[PDB]
């Protein structure tokens, strides 16, 4: 489910380069992307889709997220993707409806 | 809002007299996400839930900026963003108000 994402986002940001100006937009793109392929599997869920896009700088970080939820019904899936000089975290969350 | 300022409030509650470190980071990036956590599920939950984003930072002073594209079922889901910087720590927050 989130292979088919992975490979979008090495297909689509794959050894590029940072621009700072167009970061955002490339996250639109993204999450219009992700978009796609949330609706190529149209799960009847709420859905939510966010991207995280960053400068490879020199600070240490961790990141992950959580909740509070119907632990059975919701759940996360994602994708992390580094280069020479970015790093990008996709992340979709599934609540039931 | 008033949760956005007592998550604020929560913030340098955590993070008063301190600066960013990277040894101390760990737990206390896990203290920082569980008490906004335990922040938005105290009084104030009525049948919601909380989907939170935590980014600390050390002061550089270079061009940086958030953003965040979604697709969100509209009546029930809300965000807010939130930033904050002193001597050493940057610190932002985000904070997604979704019904349960």
């Given at each position: 489910v989130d292979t088919m994402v992975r490979e979008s986002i090495v297909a689509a940001i794959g050894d590029n380069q940072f621009a700072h100006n167009k970061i955002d937009s490339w996250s639109n793109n993204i999450v219009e992307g992700c978009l796609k392929r949330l609706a190529a599997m149209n799960k009847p869920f709420k859905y939510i889709v966010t991207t995280n896009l960053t400068q490879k700088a020199g600070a240490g970080l961790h990141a992950a997220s959580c909740a509070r939820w119907n632990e059975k019904t919701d759940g996360k899936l994602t994708v992390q993707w580094e280069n020479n000089t970015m790093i990008v975290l996709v992340s979709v969350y599934w609540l039931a409806v | 809002h008033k949760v956005q300022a007592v998550l604020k409030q929560v913030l340098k509650e955590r993070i008063e007299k301190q600066k960013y470190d990277p040894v101390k980071g760990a737990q206390i990036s896990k203290q920082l996400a569980d008490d906004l956590r335990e922040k938005v599920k105290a009084?104030?939950?009525?049948?919601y839930k909380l989907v939170i984003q935590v980014t600390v930072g050390q002061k550089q002073g270079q061009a940086m900026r958030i953003i965040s594209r979604c697709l969100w079922d509209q009546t029930n889901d809300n965000f807010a963003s939130e930033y904050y910087e002193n001597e050493s720590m940057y610190c932002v927050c985000q904070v997604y108000g979704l019904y349960y």
């Open positions: - | 009084l104030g939950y009525d049948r």
